[PDB]
Amino acid sequence: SHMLADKVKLSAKEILEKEFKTGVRGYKQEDVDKFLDMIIKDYETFHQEIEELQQENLQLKKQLEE
Amino acid sequence: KVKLSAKEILEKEFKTGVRGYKQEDVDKFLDMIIKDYETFHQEIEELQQENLQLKKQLEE
């Protein structure tokens, strides 16, 4: 019945800031950090997409008052 | 446009070095990110849906 949490768990800031423990062997850091950059780009790209579809749907409703 | 899919993040196999990141910690975080990708797409699809339903109502 209740309020909707911001359903997105992370932000672009939090991804960039995240620090991981190391082991005597694990994922090569440079490859993980690069992959995380692609992801950050996608997060930015998704918000812009949403922002635009919201504005475009608000535009369309203004036109419907007539 | 978009540079990754869920499927690509799921399937990615990093190289391992001698003092690399803990693999468990990275998977758990990647796993969070994947669920966010999913959330983003639903959000978009329902605004795409609504977008098309408003273009119909405007031609009528």
UniProtKB/Swiss-Prot annotation, chain A:
Alphabetic keyword roster: Cell cycle, Cell division, Cell shape, Coiled coil, Cytoplasm
The keyword Cell membrane is assigned to this record: no
Family membership noted in the UniProt record: Belongs to the GpsB family.
Induction, per UniProt: By high-salt conditions.
Organism expressing this protein natively: Bacillus subtilis (strain 168)
Protein known as: Cell cycle protein GpsB
Residue ranges of coiled coil: 36-66
Compartments, as annotated in UniProt: Cytoplasm
Gene this protein is translated from: gpsB
Role according to the record: Divisome component that associates with the complex late in its assembly, after the Z-ring is formed, and is dependent on DivIC and PBP2B for its recruitment to the divisome. Together with EzrA, is a key component of the system that regulates PBP1 localization during cell cycle progression. Its main role could be the removal of PBP1 from the cell pole after pole maturation is completed. Also contributes to the recruitment of PBP1 to the division complex. Not essential for septum formation.
One of the record's GO cellular component terms: cytoplasm
Whole-protein coverage range: 1 to 64 of 98
Lineage, highest ranks first: Bacteria, Bacillati, Bacillota, Bacilli, Bacillales
Residue ranges of the TM segments: none
Keyword flag Mitochondrion: no
Binding partners and assembly: Forms polymers through the coiled coil domains. Interacts with PBP1, MreC and EzrA.
Record-level GO BP terms: cell division; peptidoglycan-based cell wall biogenesis; regulation of cell shape
